[PDB]
Amino acid sequence: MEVIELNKCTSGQSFEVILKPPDPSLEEIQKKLEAAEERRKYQEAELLKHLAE
Amino acid sequence: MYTFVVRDENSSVYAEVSRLLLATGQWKRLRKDNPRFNLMLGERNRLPFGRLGHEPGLVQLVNYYRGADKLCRKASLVKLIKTSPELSESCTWFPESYVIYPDEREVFLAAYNRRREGREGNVWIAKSGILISSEASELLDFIDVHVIQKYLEKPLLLEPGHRKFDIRSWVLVDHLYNIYLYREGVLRTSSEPYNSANFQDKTCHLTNHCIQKEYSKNYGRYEEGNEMFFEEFNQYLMDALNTTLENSILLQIKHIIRSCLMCIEPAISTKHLHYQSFQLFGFDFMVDEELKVWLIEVNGAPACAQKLYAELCQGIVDVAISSVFPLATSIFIKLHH
Amino acid sequence: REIVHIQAGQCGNQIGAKFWEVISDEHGIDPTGSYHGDSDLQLERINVYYNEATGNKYVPRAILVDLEPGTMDSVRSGPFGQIFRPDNFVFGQSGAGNNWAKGHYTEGAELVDSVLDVVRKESESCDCLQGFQLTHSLGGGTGSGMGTLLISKIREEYPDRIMNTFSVMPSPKVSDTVVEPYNATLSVHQLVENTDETYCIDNEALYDICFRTLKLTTPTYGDLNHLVSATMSGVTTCLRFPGQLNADLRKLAVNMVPFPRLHFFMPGFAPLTSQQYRALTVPELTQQMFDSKNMMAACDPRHGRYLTVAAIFRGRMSMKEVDEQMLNVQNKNSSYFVEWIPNNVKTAVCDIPPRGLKMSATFIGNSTAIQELFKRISEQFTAMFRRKAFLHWYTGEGMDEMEFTEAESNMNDLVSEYQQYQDA
Amino acid sequence: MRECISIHVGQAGVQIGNACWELYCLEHGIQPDGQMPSDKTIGGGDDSFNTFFSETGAGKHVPRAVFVDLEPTVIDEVRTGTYRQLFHPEQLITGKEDAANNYARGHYTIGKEIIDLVLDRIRKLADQCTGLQGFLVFHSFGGGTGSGFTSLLMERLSVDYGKKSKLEFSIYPAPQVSTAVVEPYNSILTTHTTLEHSDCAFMVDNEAIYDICRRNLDIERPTYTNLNRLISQIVSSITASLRFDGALNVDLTEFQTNLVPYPRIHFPLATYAPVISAEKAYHEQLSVAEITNACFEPANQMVKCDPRHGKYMACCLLYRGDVVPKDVNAAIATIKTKRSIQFVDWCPTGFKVGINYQPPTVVPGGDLAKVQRAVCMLSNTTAIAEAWARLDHKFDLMYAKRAFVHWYVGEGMEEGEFSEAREDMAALEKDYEEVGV
Ligand SMILES: Nc1nc2c(ncn2[C@@H]2O[C@H](COP(=O)(O)OP(=O)(O)OP(=O)(O)O)[C@@H](O)[C@H]2O)c(=O)[nH]1
Ligand SMILES: Nc1ncnc2c1ncn2[C@@H]1O[C@H](COP(=O)(O)OP(=O)(O)CP(=O)(O)O)[C@@H](O)[C@H]1O
Ligand SMILES: Cc1nc2ccc(F)cc2n1-c1nc(N)c(F)c(Nc2ccc(C(F)(F)F)cc2)n1
Ligand SMILES: Nc1nc2c(ncn2[C@@H]2O[C@H](COP(=O)(O)OP(=O)(O)O)[C@@H](O)[C@H]2O)c(=O)[nH]1
Ligand SMILES: [Ca+2]
Ligand SMILES: [Mg+2]
Ligand SMILES: [Mg+2]
Ligand SMILES: [Mg+2]
Incomplete structure (x- = not known):
C-alpha cells in the first residue's frame, strides 16, 4: 500500500496506490465508397433491364 | 411449465435428473442450443457461462460453478491449498504435495532428502496412469503437468482381507451456497491384501473401480462391486475398533468439505450474479491407521453408486432445481456456515 | 414520410373504402375531411396517409382504380365517399371479366398510364415519399391483373420505394368464379418479385371466423370486410399514431423479411367477440392473438415456424403485463420460433384503442406455414390446368400456355423455398 | 487548455x-x-x-x-x-x-x-x-x-x-x-x-x-x-x-x-455507485468503503460480466463528493483481501485515484437522489470480452443462414465484409483470451 504522486487543488485531489509491483487514405476511402455506389448502380440497371423485358 | 436443456450426454447423474424432470409433467426439454431455457445441464468442457443470464424474463440456472475447477484439478488444488491463508501450507488434512512441470522441483527434493536421510517413510506418488515409487529419480523420469504427494504408508486396512479403501462423499452446493452432504457414501475397496513392499502391484494400492474389475484377484469377494456402504463400514468400526463412523471419520470429512468450499466461495458464488449456479461434487478421502482423514482429490463431474442414483438424483431436483422453480426428512446434512 | 395508397378492383375498393372509413374515425376526421378530434395524438402522424388541404381539411392520399364504374360509384355514394379527391377516381367502362389477362395485358394496359399520372401527382406533393400500399384481391381481373401491372410500373418509376399490399386470396368456400386459382397463381409470382411486404388475407379464414367465432350465420362480403378493415387499422397503427417506433415501412421490412421472396405475412386480430362489453385481460389478448382461430390466412402456425413476429397492443393496459405475456408465449412455445434469428418477436403499443374496444391486439407473423396457402392455390390451379380447362378465356387475350406453366412452376418454387427453412 | x-x-x-x-x-x-x-x-x-x-x-x-x-x-x-x-x-x-x-x-x-x-x-x-x-x-x-x-x-x-x-x-x-x-x-x-x-x-x-x-x-x-x-x-x-x-x-x-496498454483492447469497463431512488427522501449515505466495494459488484457495471474471471490491465477510481485519500486507501486495503482482483503479470497491481470535491449534481425532478459521495471505476478487464462473445454468437446464428444479408448487399456492400468483420472479432476475442488466461 504505497501512495504516490499526490496532487492537491481547491477542486479536488488525485494520487496513485500501488498494491504489488509487476490508416486508409482519403483516396482509398472514396474508392470503396464509389465501388459500393457502382454495385448499387449495376443492380438497379439489371432491374430496369428486367422490367424492360 | 419450466424449460431445460441437456448439453452433457455422458452424465449418468443428470441423465437421471432429466428423467425425473420430464416425469413431473412441469418441465420441458428443448434443443441443445435453444437459449430460452430456465435450466442448463451444461457440458463440462468450456461451458459458455458468459451467455447465461441475458434472456429477458427467464430466470436461468446452470449445474456448474464457474471457477470451481481450481478445486477440482489436481494441479490447481495443491496451489489453492498452499497459497490460501484459509487453508495454509500447514494444512493438517492434506498430504504434503508438490506441483512440478515436466515450479516446485527443487522444493520437492528439499524435503525428499530429509526422508531418505532419516529413513522415514519416503514413498511418494505422482498423479495428474500413475507411478508409486520410493525413489525421486524414478518419479521424475516418469514425469518427463503432474503433482507428487506423500504415499500414505500406514493406511487403515479392513478385516478380513487386510485391504485398502477410499471414501467417496457426494456434496451438493445450491445457488445460495448451502453445502449439503449426502448422508450416503461409498467405500471403494481393493480385494487383494495391502502389500507394503511391492509398490508396482497397483491392485493392492489403487482403490479405483476400473482397476478392481479388470485388474484384481477377488473382485466383489467381500462386497459386490468392491463398494461398502456406510451401514457395513459403521458396524465394522463398532465391532472392530469400538467407535462409530460419525465420530472417527465423518467429523473430519465434514470439516474438510466446509474448509474447501468456504475458501473459494468469494470466487465462485453467484449471489449477486445475473444467473445462478449449483454443482454436485465428489470428495475422495483416505483414512490412516489412527483414524485420521486425508483429502485425496475433488472432482466436479462425479458419478454415483448404482444403489444411490435414485435417492441422490431426486435430492438434486428437490434442493437445487425445485428450490428455484417450485412445482405446486432430508437425505442431506446441511453443513452450516 | 408520406405513403401513397392505391385500391384496385371491386374487392380492393370495397375494403379500401371501409379502411379509410375506419381510420378516418380514429383520427377524428369526418366525411367532409374536417377534423373534429379530441387529442393531438390523432394529428401528430396524420400526414402519413392524409393530405392537408387549405382550410385544415384532410384528404386521404388514396387512388381508386377500377375497369368498370359500378363499385367506385357506390363508394362515391357511400358513407365517406366525399372525402376522396375527386380527381383520384380513375376508371374505365369495359370491366375485366374476372380475367387476369384483361387486367394485365389488354383492358388494364389501356388504363394504367392514367393511373400513373395520378400516382405521380400525389408523389410530387410528398415531402419525402416512403412507399405505397395497394389493396386488392387476387381472384378477380382488375385488382389481380391490373393491380400487379400497376405494381410493376410503380417499381419502374420508383425503384427505391417500398411496396406493400393487402392481398385477398380466393377460396372455393367464398368464390365468384372457377378461374380464381388461375388469377391468383399469375398474381402471386408478380407479388414475389415486386412487393416488399404482402399481408395475405384468405377469404376462407374470414368466412370461418364470421361463422364459427362471430356466430354470423350466412356471412356477407360486408361482414368479411369488417374483419379486414379492423385488421388493416391495427396493422398500420404505428404508421398512424405517435409511438416509440416511427411510421417506417422500410424498417418494418428490414426486420420482418430475412429473405427477399419470403415476405408474405399472416395477419391476426383480437378480440373477436360474438359479450362485447366484457373487458379483456392482457393474458387473454395475448393468448387469442397467437391462436390460429384469430388469424386471417387459414394456415396452421403449428404446421410451420415463425421467422419473425410483430405484435401491436392498443389501449390503456399494463405495459408490464404485456411484456410478461409476450415473453411467456415465446418461452412456453419456443419450438415454433426459428432459433437462428435471435429475438425475432417485436412488441409495439399505442394508447389509442380502436373504435368500440377498451383494448386490442394485432398480430403480424412471417411464418413458413404460409406455404399451405400457396400449396392450396397450386392444387386448385393444377386440377384445372391438367385439362387446360377455361384457358380459352386467357388465350383469347393473347396469352399462351407457357406463361401458365411458368406461373405454376414459380409457385411450386415458392412453396419449396418455404419448405427448406422449416423441415429441410 | x-x-x-x-x-x-x-x-x-x-x-x-x-x-x-x-x-x-x-x-x-x-x-x-x-x-x-x-x-x-x-x-x-x-x-x-x-x-x-x-x-x-x-x-x-x-x-x-x-x-x-x-x-x-x-x-x-x-x-x-x-x-x-x-x-x-x-x-x-x-x-x-x-x-x-x-x-x-x-x-x-x-x-x-x-x-x-x-x-x-x-x-x-x-x-x-x-x-x-x-x-x-x-x-x-x-x-x-x-x-x-x-x-x-x-x-x-x-x-x-x-x-x-x-x-x-x-x-x-x-x-x-x-x-x-x-x-x-x-x-x-x-x-x-x-x-x-x-x-x-x-x-x-x-x-x-x-x-x-x-x-x-x-x-x-x-x-x-x-x-x-x-x-x-x-x-x-x-x-x-x-x-x-x-x-x-x-x-x-x-x-x-x-487505461489502454494494448491498443486493440481499448474497451474499459465502467462501474458506478451509488444509484439511489429519488422517491426515498431519506436514504442512509453510503461510505467511501461501501461505494468502493460496490465497484466490484457485477450488478453495478455498465456491462454485465464477471470480472472475477478475467485479468485487470488498469483501474481508475473517479470519486465525486465528500472523499479524502485516507478513506480511499482504507477501503482498497479491505476490498483487496475480501475480493478476487488479478492483474496481468506485465502490469502493476494498483489504482489511479481522482477526487473532485463537488458531489454529483442531479437534474431537478429526475429519478436519481443526490448523494454525498459517488465513484465511477474504469477498469480494463478481459471479462468484458463476454459481451463480444454474446454478440458474435448471435451474429453467427443469423449469418449461417445468410438471414437479412440481402438488405446489406442491396446497398452496395459486399457479402465478404460480413466475414471480414466477423473474422476481426474472432481475433479480438482471441486477444482477450491470451491476456486473461
Ligand atoms: N441508452 C439508449 N439507447 C438508445 C436510445 N435510442 C436508441 N437506443 C438504442 O440504439 C439502438 C438503435 O439505434 P438508433 O440510435 O436508435 O438508430 P439510428 O442511429 O438513429 O440509425 P437509423 O434509425 O437506422 O437511421 C437500439 O439498440 C436502441 O436500444 C437512447 O436514447 N438511449
Ligand atoms: N497420497 C496417497 N497415499 C496413498 N494412496 C493414494 C495417495 N494418492 C492417491 N492414492 C490412491 O490412488 C487412488 C487414485 O488416486 P486418484 O486421486 O488420482 O483417483 P482418480 O482421480 O485417478 C479417480 P477419482 O476421480 O474417482 O478419484 C486413490 O483411490 C488412492 O487409493
Ligand atoms: C411500421 C410498424 N408497424 C408495426 C406494427 C407492429 C410492430 F411490432 C412493428 C411495427 N412497425 C415498425 N416500425 C418501425 N419504425 C420499426 F423500426 C419497426 N421495427 C421492427 C419490426 C419488427 C420486428 C420483428 F421483431 F418483428 F422482427 C423488429 C423490429 N417496426
Ligand atoms: N373479402 C372480400 N373479398 C371480395 C370482395 N369482393 C370480391 N371479393 C373476392 O375477390 C375475388 C373476385 O375479385 P374482384 O375484386 O371482385 O374482381 P375485380 O374487380 O376484377 O378485381 C373473389 O375471390 C372474391 O371472393 C369483398 O368485398 N370482400
Ligand atoms: Ca470565460
Ligand atoms: Mg479424479
Ligand atoms: Mg367481382
Ligand atoms: Mg434513427
Whole structure:
C-alpha cells in the first residue's frame, strides 16, 4: 500500500496506490465508397433491364 | 411449465435428473442450443457461462460453478491449498504435495532428502496412469503437468482381507451456497491384501473401480462391486475398533468439505450474479491407521453408486432445481456456515 | 414520410373504402375531411396517409382504380365517399371479366398510364415519399391483373420505394368464379418479385371466423370486410399514431423479411367477440392473438415456424403485463420460433384503442406455414390446368400456355423455398 | 487548455448527448440561455470548462458539439427543447431519410452523400480551437446511422485529424430495449471498421442500465429518458477531469495512457455507485468503503460480466463528493483481501485515484437522489470480452443462414465484409483470451 504522486487543488485531489509491483487514405476511402455506389448502380440497371423485358 | 436443456450426454447423474424432470409433467426439454431455457445441464468442457443470464424474463440456472475447477484439478488444488491463508501450507488434512512441470522441483527434493536421510517413510506418488515409487529419480523420469504427494504408508486396512479403501462423499452446493452432504457414501475397496513392499502391484494400492474389475484377484469377494456402504463400514468400526463412523471419520470429512468450499466461495458464488449456479461434487478421502482423514482429490463431474442414483438424483431436483422453480426428512446434512 | 395508397378492383375498393372509413374515425376526421378530434395524438402522424388541404381539411392520399364504374360509384355514394379527391377516381367502362389477362395485358394496359399520372401527382406533393400500399384481391381481373401491372410500373418509376399490399386470396368456400386459382397463381409470382411486404388475407379464414367465432350465420362480403378493415387499422397503427417506433415501412421490412421472396405475412386480430362489453385481460389478448382461430390466412402456425413476429397492443393496459405475456408465449412455445434469428418477436403499443374496444391486439407473423396457402392455390390451379380447362378465356387475350406453366412452376418454387427453412 | 469536440450520431447518440449537455450546464452553472454568471471573463478565457464550451462576446457559452442524424425527428427536439438557446443552427445536421437499421445504408448509400457536410461543420468548430485534443463520439451499435455513419466519420476523422485522439461512448444492444433484429450485424460491422480508429471506447449495455433502473430506481418500465439520465451521470464522471481542475485524466491522451496498454483492447469497463431512488427522501449515505466495494459488484457495471474471471490491465477510481485519500486507501486495503482482483503479470497491481470535491449534481425532478459521495471505476478487464462473445454468437446464428444479408448487399456492400468483420472479432476475442488466461 504505497501512495504516490499526490496532487492537491481547491477542486479536488488525485494520487496513485500501488498494491504489488509487476490508416486508409482519403483516396482509398472514396474508392470503396464509389465501388459500393457502382454495385448499387449495376443492380438497379439489371432491374430496369428486367422490367424492360 | 419450466424449460431445460441437456448439453452433457455422458452424465449418468443428470441423465437421471432429466428423467425425473420430464416425469413431473412441469418441465420441458428443448434443443441443445435453444437459449430460452430456465435450466442448463451444461457440458463440462468450456461451458459458455458468459451467455447465461441475458434472456429477458427467464430466470436461468446452470449445474456448474464457474471457477470451481481450481478445486477440482489436481494441479490447481495443491496451489489453492498452499497459497490460501484459509487453508495454509500447514494444512493438517492434506498430504504434503508438490506441483512440478515436466515450479516446485527443487522444493520437492528439499524435503525428499530429509526422508531418505532419516529413513522415514519416503514413498511418494505422482498423479495428474500413475507411478508409486520410493525413489525421486524414478518419479521424475516418469514425469518427463503432474503433482507428487506423500504415499500414505500406514493406511487403515479392513478385516478380513487386510485391504485398502477410499471414501467417496457426494456434496451438493445450491445457488445460495448451502453445502449439503449426502448422508450416503461409498467405500471403494481393493480385494487383494495391502502389500507394503511391492509398490508396482497397483491392485493392492489403487482403490479405483476400473482397476478392481479388470485388474484384481477377488473382485466383489467381500462386497459386490468392491463398494461398502456406510451401514457395513459403521458396524465394522463398532465391532472392530469400538467407535462409530460419525465420530472417527465423518467429523473430519465434514470439516474438510466446509474448509474447501468456504475458501473459494468469494470466487465462485453467484449471489449477486445475473444467473445462478449449483454443482454436485465428489470428495475422495483416505483414512490412516489412527483414524485420521486425508483429502485425496475433488472432482466436479462425479458419478454415483448404482444403489444411490435414485435417492441422490431426486435430492438434486428437490434442493437445487425445485428450490428455484417450485412445482405446486432430508437425505442431506446441511453443513452450516 | 408520406405513403401513397392505391385500391384496385371491386374487392380492393370495397375494403379500401371501409379502411379509410375506419381510420378516418380514429383520427377524428369526418366525411367532409374536417377534423373534429379530441387529442393531438390523432394529428401528430396524420400526414402519413392524409393530405392537408387549405382550410385544415384532410384528404386521404388514396387512388381508386377500377375497369368498370359500378363499385367506385357506390363508394362515391357511400358513407365517406366525399372525402376522396375527386380527381383520384380513375376508371374505365369495359370491366375485366374476372380475367387476369384483361387486367394485365389488354383492358388494364389501356388504363394504367392514367393511373400513373395520378400516382405521380400525389408523389410530387410528398415531402419525402416512403412507399405505397395497394389493396386488392387476387381472384378477380382488375385488382389481380391490373393491380400487379400497376405494381410493376410503380417499381419502374420508383425503384427505391417500398411496396406493400393487402392481398385477398380466393377460396372455393367464398368464390365468384372457377378461374380464381388461375388469377391468383399469375398474381402471386408478380407479388414475389415486386412487393416488399404482402399481408395475405384468405377469404376462407374470414368466412370461418364470421361463422364459427362471430356466430354470423350466412356471412356477407360486408361482414368479411369488417374483419379486414379492423385488421388493416391495427396493422398500420404505428404508421398512424405517435409511438416509440416511427411510421417506417422500410424498417418494418428490414426486420420482418430475412429473405427477399419470403415476405408474405399472416395477419391476426383480437378480440373477436360474438359479450362485447366484457373487458379483456392482457393474458387473454395475448393468448387469442397467437391462436390460429384469430388469424386471417387459414394456415396452421403449428404446421410451420415463425421467422419473425410483430405484435401491436392498443389501449390503456399494463405495459408490464404485456411484456410478461409476450415473453411467456415465446418461452412456453419456443419450438415454433426459428432459433437462428435471435429475438425475432417485436412488441409495439399505442394508447389509442380502436373504435368500440377498451383494448386490442394485432398480430403480424412471417411464418413458413404460409406455404399451405400457396400449396392450396397450386392444387386448385393444377386440377384445372391438367385439362387446360377455361384457358380459352386467357388465350383469347393473347396469352399462351407457357406463361401458365411458368406461373405454376414459380409457385411450386415458392412453396419449396418455404419448405427448406422449416423441415429441410 | 485544449478543446474537446463532442459528436453525437443517430438517435441514441443525440438523445444521450442532450442529457449530457444538460448535466454539464447544471454542473458548471450555465443557464439554458447560455449565460454563466460565475464566469467573470466574458467572451473569452482558457478555463477548464472552456475545453467543452466556447464563448461569444455576448457571454453565451456554446457547447463544442455537433449533432448528426439522418432523420430530423430527434434533432428537431434539441432545437426546440429547454437548451435550444445553447446551440446555433450550424451545429445540428439532419437528413431526410434514415438508415433503416441498416449499417450498409448508413455507411455507403446515405453516408457518402452527407459526410462532407458533417466534416465541414466539424471543421468549423475546430477552427475555433487553439489546441484541439480530439473528439468524443456518441452513438449506438445497433442503429443504421449510429453504426454505419459513425464508422465512416471515424475513418475520415483519422484522415483529417491524424494526430487527434478519438474516444467513443457506444450503446451495446439489448433486446429489452432493442429496436431491430439485425443489430448484431450492425454492431460487428461497425466495430470491425472503427477498431483501428478509436483510441478508447466506453461501452454501455442497455441491459445493464435497464436493470439498474429497475432495481435501484424502482422503475418498472424504464424509458430512454430514465436510461439517458443515468448514462449521462457515468459520462459526466468520466469527462469531469477534462472540465474541472485536476491532475488525473487531464487530456484525452491520458485516457489511453492510463487505461489502454494494448491498443486493440481499448474497451474499459465502467462501474458506478451509488444509484439511489429519488422517491426515498431519506436514504442512509453510503461510505467511501461501501461505494468502493460496490465497484466490484457485477450488478453495478455498465456491462454485465464477471470480472472475477478475467485479468485487470488498469483501474481508475473517479470519486465525486465528500472523499479524502485516507478513506480511499482504507477501503482498497479491505476490498483487496475480501475480493478476487488479478492483474496481468506485465502490469502493476494498483489504482489511479481522482477526487473532485463537488458531489454529483442531479437534474431537478429526475429519478436519481443526490448523494454525498459517488465513484465511477474504469477498469480494463478481459471479462468484458463476454459481451463480444454474446454478440458474435448471435451474429453467427443469423449469418449461417445468410438471414437479412440481402438488405446489406442491396446497398452496395459486399457479402465478404460480413466475414471480414466477423473474422476481426474472432481475433479480438482471441486477444482477450491470451491476456486473461
Ligand atoms: N441508452 C439508449 N439507447 C438508445 C436510445 N435510442 C436508441 N437506443 C438504442 O440504439 C439502438 C438503435 O439505434 P438508433 O440510435 O436508435 O438508430 P439510428 O442511429 O438513429 O440509425 P437509423 O434509425 O437506422 O437511421 C437500439 O439498440 C436502441 O436500444 C437512447 O436514447 N438511449
Ligand atoms: N497420497 C496417497 N497415499 C496413498 N494412496 C493414494 C495417495 N494418492 C492417491 N492414492 C490412491 O490412488 C487412488 C487414485 O488416486 P486418484 O486421486 O488420482 O483417483 P482418480 O482421480 O485417478 C479417480 P477419482 O476421480 O474417482 O478419484 C486413490 O483411490 C488412492 O487409493
Ligand atoms: C411500421 C410498424 N408497424 C408495426 C406494427 C407492429 C410492430 F411490432 C412493428 C411495427 N412497425 C415498425 N416500425 C418501425 N419504425 C420499426 F423500426 C419497426 N421495427 C421492427 C419490426 C419488427 C420486428 C420483428 F421483431 F418483428 F422482427 C423488429 C423490429 N417496426
Ligand atoms: N373479402 C372480400 N373479398 C371480395 C370482395 N369482393 C370480391 N371479393 C373476392 O375477390 C375475388 C373476385 O375479385 P374482384 O375484386 O371482385 O374482381 P375485380 O374487380 O376484377 O378485381 C373473389 O375471390 C372474391 O371472393 C369483398 O368485398 N370482400
Ligand atoms: Ca470565460
Ligand atoms: Mg479424479
Ligand atoms: Mg367481382
Ligand atoms: Mg434513427
